[PDB]
Amino acid sequence: TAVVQRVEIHKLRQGENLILGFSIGGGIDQDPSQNPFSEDKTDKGIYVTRVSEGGPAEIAGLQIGDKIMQVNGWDMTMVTHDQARKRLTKRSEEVVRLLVTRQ
Amino acid sequence: ANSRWPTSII
Structure with missing residues (x-):
């Protein structure tokens, strides 16, 4: 099943930008069947x-x-x-504080 | 990478 985790990220300045050091996929405008990480492909x-x-x-x-x-x-x-x-x-x-679930 | 599933660096 999934476990709830709460993380607190302190962004790192890299030149003019504040960066988080990760990448994201997904969103309601994307094809969920293409997500390799999700348990449920909907x-x-x-x-x-x-x-x-x-x-x-x-x-x-x-x-x-x-x-x-x-x-x-x-x-x-x-x-x-x-x-x-x-x-x-x-x-x-x-x-930024993220509420996440982890399999 | 997957052209039909974009990712973004943040």
Whole structure:
């Protein structure tokens, strides 16, 4: 089954950007049957597809395959891919808390 | 990578 995890990522400055050190796939505008990480291939949610060795997300405990449920209290289960990306990369936010589930 | 399933670096 899935276990709930709560991680707290402190973004890393890389030049002008604040970065999280991971990648995402999914979103309501994408084909969920293409998601290799989900248990249920109708799941249109946002999944962690890669984590950078030594980066903020790794340090915080994020793992490849995690499903992102919320970012700073903001629901991520019914958003487009771009909407998810934007929520994760707000320039004004250095700290982001992710609610995730992990198989 | 999968052209039918984009990923984004953040």
